[PDB]
Amino acid sequence: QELFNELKPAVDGANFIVNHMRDQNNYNEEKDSWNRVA
C-alpha cells in the first residue's frame, strides 16, 4: 500500500495540528477559570 505510506506524513501532521489545538483550548480554558476566580 504505497498510498497510505505516502499519506502517513499527512496523518501525522493532522494529528499534530489537532494536539496543538486541543492543548491551546485547554490552556485558554484554564485562563478563563482564572478570570472567573478574579
Binding site: 497510505f4 496523518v11 494529528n15 495540528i17 489537532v18 489545538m21 486541543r22
Partner: peptide
C-alpha cells in the same frame, strides 16, 4: 485505513476542530 487508529484519531480531530470553532 479503517483498522488504523491514527486515521480515526485524525478524523475525530478534524471533527473536534470544526465543533470547537463553531
Amino acid at each position: 485505513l479503517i483498522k488504523h487508529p491514527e486515521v480515526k484519531s485524525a478524523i475525530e480531530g478534524i471533527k473536534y476542530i470544526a465543533e470547537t470553532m463553531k
